[PDB]
Amino acid sequence: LWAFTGPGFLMSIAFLDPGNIESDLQAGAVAGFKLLWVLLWATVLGLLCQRLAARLGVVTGKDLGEVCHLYYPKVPRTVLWLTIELAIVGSDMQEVIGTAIAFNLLSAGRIPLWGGVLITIVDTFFFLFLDNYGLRKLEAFFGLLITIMALTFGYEYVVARPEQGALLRGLFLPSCPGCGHPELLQAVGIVGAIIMPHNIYLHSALVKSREIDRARRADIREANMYFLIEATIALSVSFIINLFVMAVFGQAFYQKTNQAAFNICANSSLHDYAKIFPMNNATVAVDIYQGGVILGCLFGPAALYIWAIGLLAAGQSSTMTGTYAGQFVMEGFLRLRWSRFARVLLTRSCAILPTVLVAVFRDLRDLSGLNDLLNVLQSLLLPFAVLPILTFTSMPTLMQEFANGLLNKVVTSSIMVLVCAINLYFVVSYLPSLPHPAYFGLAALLAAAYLGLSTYLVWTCCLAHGATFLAHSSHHHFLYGL
Ligand SMILES: [Mn+2]
């Protein structure tokens, strides 16, 4: 019967991390049905990236990790693995921040911000205690949880009655009406959170698991096509869900004042989450807790709880996704297979200490600013995963027949230059807030190292495709290949 009735949705329900909810709600509060075009373009852009990743994993037979280990010296291998691990621990930081904010939400502030931290450590204990074939059952249960929250949440979206013309125009037309610095920050966070560096690696690794006959190129072609349909189904589902979430939050939060929210929640059933808001009539600083509060205010008392459990399930799925990706990237780059327990413990700890410090000495708004900064960090770390994949899918020696057509190379050059332009704009927008002489120091040195690794990657990819009539004799193994 249907050979696609079930496959495809699984990858999406793992593409929908809590970050695509938090950055979503920040963008929806900062602007209405405006940044949706950024969402659509990012979804298409990640569709292209996942197509490239599946291509590489299918035809080559290796993953990004194995090819990177094979085709790099020790220093760039190590620094690239460090950046990938930084991306994974940043995703885990976003997950723990979301879970902690949700847990602070549940008890009406009785549990402290590090109470959520302790429950995440309990979750890691649960993972290590299970570590069995029944883990897939728990993953299915949590996937059903996020699925049901998404379904009831789409019901709430259609209840919200979004103005059709406004969000249709915002989606199909890329205008930026009255945009400024915070909306720039939210757009960059969206483009860096909808798609993430470690998804490409993990997708390639999972693609490698599929056995390929290799006798004829036909089986490779059909496998690549089927995986492309899988990826496009997942991306379309993710984009639809994020469109629903962005539209509803922008409808409920665009030109919303503290007095307005207090007045609506004073008229509703809910009370403690009615009195949370202050009385200032100014613009509202918006985080996950207030988003859940207004959700429960408008769409019913159970909305708070369902949003909370959905966020928790998304965080758990993202945690499993991250530990899988981390195990694969270490096994590839550094050629060591650690148990899943080692990965989850390492990533969870390396995420938990900074979040513990910030939560214990700062407030909720600082947490939201911090995890927005993690989304932007994922944006800045995108190139370190988007150049190697193009380098290895355009390389004539691992794959001869299924190389890259000139249209694909030029559009990938466009992706790289565009992402570089957005990152450069963000850096020039954010750096001026360092008003101390000689303070540039370590941060500037790290930025210089970032640019040096970027230049190294640019040189490598230029060797991969071009280098004709202009190349250096040293490090000539790239063009010939191994
Ligand atoms: Mn995402």
95: nearest Cα among 314, 307, 315, 311: 315
Residues 6+ apart with CB under 8 A from 454: 383, 384
The rounded Å distance from CA 43 to ligand 1 centre is 10
The rounded Å distance from CA 19 to ligand 1 centre is 6
The rounded Å distance from CA 190 to ligand 1 centre is 9
For residues 186 and 31, is the Cβ–Cβ distance under 8 A?
yes
Residue spans per domain, the chain: 9-381
The rounded Å distance from CA 13 to ligand 1 centre is 10
The rounded Å distance from CA 58 to ligand 1 centre is 23
Q: How far apart (Å, rounded) are the C-alpha atoms in residues 83 and 74?
A: 14
The rounded Å distance from CA 440 to ligand 1 centre is 32
The rounded Å distance from CA 195 to ligand 1 centre is 5
Q: What technique solved it?
A: cryo-EM
Q: Which resolution, in Å, applies to this structure?
A: 3.7
- Give the per-residue SS3 of the chain: CCCCCCCCHHHHHHHCCCHHHHHHHHHHHHCCCCCHHHHHHHHHHHHHHHHHHHHHHHHHCCCHHHHHHHCCCHHHHHHHHHHHHHHHHHHHHHHHHHHHHHHHHHCCCCCCHHHHHHHHHHHHHHHHHHCCCCHHHHHHHHHHHHHHHHHHHHHHHHHHCCCHHHHHHHHHCCCCCCCCHHHHHHHHHHHHHHCCHHHHHHHHHHHHCCCCCCCCHHHHHHHHHHHHHHHHHHHHHHHHHHHHHHHHHHHHHCCCEHHHHHHHHHCCCCCHHHHCCCCCCCECCCCHHHHHHHHHHHHCHHHHHHHHHHHHHHHHHHHHHHHHHHHHHHHHHCCCCCCHHHHHHHHHHHHHHHHHHHHHHCCHHHHHHHHHHHHHHHHHHCHHHHHHHHHHHCCCCCCCCCCCCHHHHHHHHHHHHHHHHHHHHHHHHHCCCCCCCCCCHHHHHHHHHHHHHHHHHHHHHHHHHCCCCCCCCCCCHHHHCC
User: Cα 330 to the chain's mean position, in Å?
Assistant: 20
463 — alpha (psi -120 to 50), left (phi > 0) or beta? alpha
Q: How far apart (Å, rounded) are the C-alpha atoms in residues 308 and 288?
A: 10
The rounded Å distance from CA 21 to ligand 1 centre is 9
What torsion do the CA atoms of 323, 328, 334, 337 make, to the nearest 10 degrees?
A: 80
The rounded Å distance from CA 275 to ligand 1 centre is 33
Residue 46 buriedness (CB in 10 A; 0-12 / 13-18 / 19+): buried
What tokens were used for 353?
A: 């200490």
The rounded Å distance from CA 479 to ligand 1 centre is 34
The rounded Å distance from CA 15 to ligand 1 centre is 5
The rounded Å distance from CA 187 to ligand 1 centre is 14
The rounded Å distance from CA 193 to ligand 1 centre is 5
Q: How far apart (Å, rounded) are the C-alpha atoms in residues 30 and 250?
A: 8
The rounded Å distance from CA 108 to ligand 1 centre is 28
Residue 349 to residues 78, 87, 102, 398: CA-CA distances in angstroms? 21, 14, 20, 38
The rounded Å distance from CA 266 to ligand 1 centre is 35
The rounded Å distance from CA 146 to ligand 1 centre is 14
The rounded Å distance from CA 54 to ligand 1 centre is 18
For residues 241 and 150, is the Cβ–Cβ distance under 8 A?
yes
Q: How far apart (Å, rounded) are the C-alpha atoms in residues 395 and 100?
A: 44
The rounded Å distance from CA 16 to ligand 1 centre is 5
The rounded Å distance from CA 123 to ligand 1 centre is 22
The rounded Å distance from CA 369 to ligand 1 centre is 18
Residue 152 to residues 103, 167, 265, 365: CA-CA distances in angstroms? 21, 21, 21, 28
The rounded Å distance from CA 6 to ligand 1 centre is 21
Q: Which amino acid is at 78?
A: T
The rounded Å distance from CA 95 to ligand 1 centre is 11
The rounded Å distance from CA 310 to ligand 1 centre is 15
The rounded Å distance from CA 412 to ligand 1 centre is 20
The rounded Å distance from CA 228 to ligand 1 centre is 18
What tokens were used for 138?
A: 């728990």
The rounded Å distance from CA 194 to ligand 1 centre is 4
The rounded Å distance from CA 88 to ligand 1 centre is 12
Q: At which residue do the structure tokens 């991390």 appear?
A: 17
Which residues, by Cβ under 5 Å, contact ligand 1, an ion? 17, 20
The rounded Å distance from CA 20 to ligand 1 centre is 5
Q: How far apart (Å, rounded) are the C-alpha atoms in residues 192 and 439?
A: 28
Q: Which amino acid is at 43?
A: T
Angle at 304 between CA 298 and CA 308, to 5 degrees: 145
Q: How many CB atoms lie within 10 A of CB 269?
A: 10
The rounded Å distance from CA 46 to ligand 1 centre is 10
Architecture (CATH level 2) of domain 9-381: Up-down Bundle (1.20)
358: nearest Cα among 101, 166, 181: 101
